């Protein structure tokens, strides 16, 4: 709590006979996007997406643009290599996904680093939390692991994940402190929707919260209900906050027996919500 992260997400998607692969790079501080590159957008530059990063100079934008474009070229070569390892044709569209970054404490101290790679939406290879070894998902990925071990890839990446990554994350938190060093606890309420004369949906709501992590749980007489609960994915409002809900179908007249429990880092107590007619 009061922890922070910097994360970059990359997606390369091949489109044989329709051009070079689509490449999309996104950077986030905590749950706030600050940069993007999209091969299909107008500029072919890394571009600002938060007002505090705009104050960076032309040399910052030049270097990020060159660096992001080299990530793109590597992924494009990898799309060819992995197609060979998995023995797939030149005609289908394939996907490489990559995420890496670092976490720090509320005092700016390194907590951890991570990098994970996927191929066609499944684990390919990951850097382990010790930042000195890899885990491959299958025997194709172990060929990559051998190359990366021989080339000492983890040692160069580690110096970025616990040095460069952390110091820039500390800079961005400072440059953006008015916006990024905030916690918005969820504004919660409960709604009630009959589905018949004899049953109704209780929906437990959390709105306006930041950062995005939250837990919503239904209990009946204090016994868990996780298998009869509908949960939706935590969704963005578009103003920098998030929303979520969880619902349970109940017998009309037994509403007061159910409770909804809300856990967010910005909440003094865990909240307990209950539908009471009287």
């Amino acid at each position: 709590s009061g922890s922070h992260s910097m994360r970059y997400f990359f997606t390369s998607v091949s489109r044989p006979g329709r051009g070079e692969p689509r490449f999309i790079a996104v950077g986030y501080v905590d749950d706030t996007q600050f940069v993007r590159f999209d091969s299909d957008a107008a500029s072919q530059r890394m571009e600002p997406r938060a007002p505090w990063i705009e104050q960076e100079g032309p040399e910052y934008w030049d270097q990020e643009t060159r660096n992001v474009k080299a990530q793109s070229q590597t992924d494009r070569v990898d799309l060819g290599t992995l197609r060979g390892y998995y023995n797939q044709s030149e005609a289908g569209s394939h996907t490489i996904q990559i995420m890496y970054g670092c976490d720090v404490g509320s005092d700016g101290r390194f907590l951890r680093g991570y990098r994970q790679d996927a191929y066609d939406g499944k684990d390919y290879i990951a850097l382990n939390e010790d930042l000195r070894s890899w885990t491959a998902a299958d025997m194709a990925a172990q060929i990559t692991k051998r190359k990366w071990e021989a080339a000492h890839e983890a040692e160069q990446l580690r110096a970025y994940l616990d040095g460069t990554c952390v110091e820039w994350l500390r800079r961005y938190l400072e440059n953006g402190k008015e916006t990024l060093q905030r916690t918005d606890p969820p504004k919660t309420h409960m709604t009630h929707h009959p589905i018949s004369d004899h049953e109704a949906t209780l929906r437990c709501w959390a709105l306006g919260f930041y950062p995005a992590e939250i837990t919503l749980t239904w209990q009946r007489d204090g016994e868990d209900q996780t298998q009869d609960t509908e949960l939706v994915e935590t969704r963005p409002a578009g103003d920098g906050t998030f929303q979520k809900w969880a619902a349970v179908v109940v017998p009309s007249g037994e509403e007061q027996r159910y409770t909804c429990h809300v856990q967010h880092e910005g909440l003094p107590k865990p909240l307990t919500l209950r539908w009471e007619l009287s």
Binding site: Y8, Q73, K147, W148, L157, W168
Partner: peptide, 9 residues
């Protein structure tokens, strides 16, 4: 800022 690119898979 983004990391240097790893070598090929």
């Amino acid at each position: 800022t983004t990391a240097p690119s790893l070598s090929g898979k």
